[PDB]
A paper describes a structure:
By contrast, in vertebrates the clustered protocadherins (Pcdhs) provide analogous cell-surface diversity, but in this case generated through stochastic alternative promoter choice. Biophysical measurements with domain-deleted proteins showed that Pcdhs also interact in cis, through a membrane-proximal dimer interface involving extracellular cadherin domain 6 (EC6) and potentially EC5. The specificity-determining cell-cell recognition interface of Pcdhs involves domains EC1–4, as shown experimentally through mutagenesis analysis and suggested by mutation correlation analysis.
From these experiments we obtained crystals of γA4EC3–6 and γB2EC3–6, which diffracted to sufficient resolution for crystal structure determination. X-ray diffraction by the γA4EC3–6 crystals was significantly anisotropic, and therefore anisotropic resolution limits were applied. The resolution of the final refined structures was 3.0/4.3/2.85 Å for γA4EC3–6 and 2.3 Å for γB2EC3–6. The two structures are similar overall (RMSD of 3.02 Å over 405 Cα’s), although γA4EC3–6 shows a more pronounced EC4–EC5 bend angle (32.6° for γA4 vs. 18.6° for γB2). These are the first Pcdh structures containing EC6, which displays the classic beta sandwich fold, but with a large insertion between the A and A’ strands. Notably the G-strands of both EC6 domains are decorated with O-mannose groups on neighboring surface-facing residues, three for γB2 and four for γA4. The γA4EC3–6 structure did not show any protein:protein interactions consistent with cis interactions in the crystal which, given that this γA family member is monomeric in solution, was expected. Furthermore, O-mannosylation is observed at EC6 G-strand residues 624, 626, and 628 (γB2 numbering) of both the γB2 and γA4 structures—on the opposite molecular face to the mutations that disrupt cell surface delivery.
Numbering used by the authors: 210 to 243, 247 to 539, 544 to 638
Write the structure that this text describes.
């Protein structure tokens, strides 16, 4: 009779990743009469013909083309058998393909937002993306990941549609740009990830003013100073960017000695270098109060004020004046009967400067009769040091020198003519 298969249908359950040529199964037919047995496909299917290879003699079924679960999951194959002339025996072969997580998730970004205002309202849609995975089961479910520390809340809009919203108010002065990476994680083991990142640039509002490094300033200038002298350097900082962060310096206008402030001090608008336009004579005025403003470009401008206090330092640049005596007989008198210590005269002198530069000391330089008189060091009193004698001359002359105590010191000289009275 006809041959007999060991089973009218053969089953197998294999994974889709089975290498080509791997033996799938083996079909057996036997003749019961007492040989040569043919094994051939029955109704050849083009997909089944490409995907499965069997020879007649071995009767083994091996893989000819890679099986993709995503293409087809079940195969119904018709097989028969010949003994030569006799009736062809029929038998089915059923191949169950299993799913292997061999497709990482594919993320398609539908909408996006590439810029956001600093003081913007939270809740703006940053991105609306959808993820699709070709695999099946838990190998096909997908989760969307965003860095944890970054303060935003991501939620799923509907089904596999997700939204990326702003949970925390944004401020440009913290970080400039963003490289936000959403990583798609597969649930099937081992998991397969596919990450996609989006770029962003933060809009910058002019909401911060320029701030000075010190709440108040104070500089010092010598009395005489060159034209265009470098007095100070001022610097203010603006945490913004672009036009909204440039600094421009100005000197608020006041009046000194009836003259505008622009007469003595200028500032460079770009570099806070304070320049002195004239020399500040200490005996004319000692100090001036200034106000420095710093603004930014763009609209509207945003500025700040700082209180500068400029002080001129005195310099010994004035010789003492001897107001007494001047060129009334220039001759002072002294009695012949004058006791020791008689106040003959007293030198009067002043000094335009201040402090040690206005500290006068008078000393005796030259005397017609040496031990007769005495000049008070700090009072300038010309007095008698001894009693007068008949030998002493009728007309006397002293040379007094007035010194200031500055650095370096300056002196003056005066000759006193003192007549001896009788
Ligand atoms: C965002 O950052 C990632 C890094 O986390 C960047 O990825 C780099 O890409 C270059 C170019 O192909 C690779 O050579 C590096 O290996 C990647 N860095 C890694 C893996 O850490 C990505 O290009 C950035 N994109 C934007 C828009 O900023
Ligand atoms: C600067 O002037 C503004 C108003 O013009 C004022 O609000 C501010 O207090 C002033 N600066 C200082 C340090 O007082
Ligand atoms: C010019 O130079 C002086 C030093 O001589 C600085 O102190 C000033 O700030 C400016 O830079
Ligand atoms: C601001 O910039 C000036 C330059 O003009 C410096 O001299 C100052 O010390 C501050 O850094
Ligand atoms: C008065 O005295 C001072 C200091 O002794 C001198 O520097 C000056 O020239 C004048 O003679
Ligand atoms: C006082 O005396 C001195 C002498 O050294 C002169 O140099 C000066 O001009 C003043 O007459
Ligand atoms: C007064 O006269 C004397 C001369 O003894 C000078 O030395 C002095 O400088 C001042 O002219
Ligand atoms: C007496 O004479 C002297 C010059 O010898 C003067 O310096 C003095 O002021 C007074 O006239
Ligand atoms: Ca596959
Ligand atoms: Ca698969
Ligand atoms: Ca997958
Ligand atoms: Ca801000
Ligand atoms: Ca800003
Ligand atoms: Ca600003
Ligand atoms: Ca002077
Ligand atoms: Ca002076
Ligand atoms: Ca002086």
């Amino acid at each position: 009779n006809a041959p007999v298969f060991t089973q009218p249908e053969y089953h197998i359950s294999v994974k889709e990743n089975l290498p080509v040529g791997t033996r799938l199964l083996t079909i057996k037919a036997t003749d019961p009469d007492e040989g040569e047995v043919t094994y051939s496909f029955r109704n050849v299917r083009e997909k089944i013909s490409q995907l499965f290879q069997l020879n007649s003699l071995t009767g083994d079924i091996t893989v000819l083309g890679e099986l993709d679960y995503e293409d087809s999951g079940f195969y119904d194959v018709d097989v028969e058998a010949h003994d030569g002339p006799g009736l062809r025996a029929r038998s089915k072969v059923l191949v169950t393909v299993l799913d292997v997580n061999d497709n990482a998730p594919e993320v398609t970004v539908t909408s996006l937002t590439s810029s956001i205002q600093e003081a913007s309202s939270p809740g703006t849609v940053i991105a609306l993306f959808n993820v699709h995975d070709s695999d099946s089961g838990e190998n096909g479910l997908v989760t969307c990941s965003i860095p944890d520390n970054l303060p935003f809340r991501l939620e799923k809009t509907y089904g596999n549609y997700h939204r990326l919203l702003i949970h925390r108010t944004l401020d440009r002065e913290e970080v400039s740009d963003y490289n936000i990476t959403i990583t798609a994680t597969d649930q099937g083991t081992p998991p397969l990830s596919t990450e996609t990142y989006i770029s962003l640039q933060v809009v910058d509002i002019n909401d911060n003013p320029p701030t000075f490094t010190h709440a108040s300033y104070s500089a010092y200038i010598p009395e005489n100073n060159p034209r265009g002298a470098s007095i100070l350097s001022i610097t203010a900082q603006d945490p913004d960017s672009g036009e909204n962060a440039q600094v421009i310096y100005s000197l608020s206008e006041d009046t000194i000695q009836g003259a505008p402030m622009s007469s003595y001090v200028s500032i460079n608008s770009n570099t806070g270098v304070l320049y002195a336009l004239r020399s500040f004579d200490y005996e004319q005025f000692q100090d001036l109060k200034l106000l420095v403003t710093a603004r930014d470009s763009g609209t509207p401008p945003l500025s700040s004020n700082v209180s500068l206090s400029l002080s001129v330092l005195d310099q010994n640049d004035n010789t003492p004046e001897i107001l007494y005596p001047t060129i009334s007989t220039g001759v002072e008198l002294t009695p012949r009967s004058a006791d020791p210590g008689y106040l003959v005269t007293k030198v009067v002198a002043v000094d335009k400067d201040s402090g040690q530069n206005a500290w006068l000391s008078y000393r005796l330089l030259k005397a017609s009769e040496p031990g007769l008189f005495s000049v008070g060091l700090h009072t300038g009193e010309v007095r008698t040091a001894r009693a007068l004698l008949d030998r002493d001359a009728l007309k006397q002359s002293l040379v007094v020198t007035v010194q200031d105590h500055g650095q370096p010191p300056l002196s003056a000289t005066v000759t006193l003519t003192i007549a001896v009275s009788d």
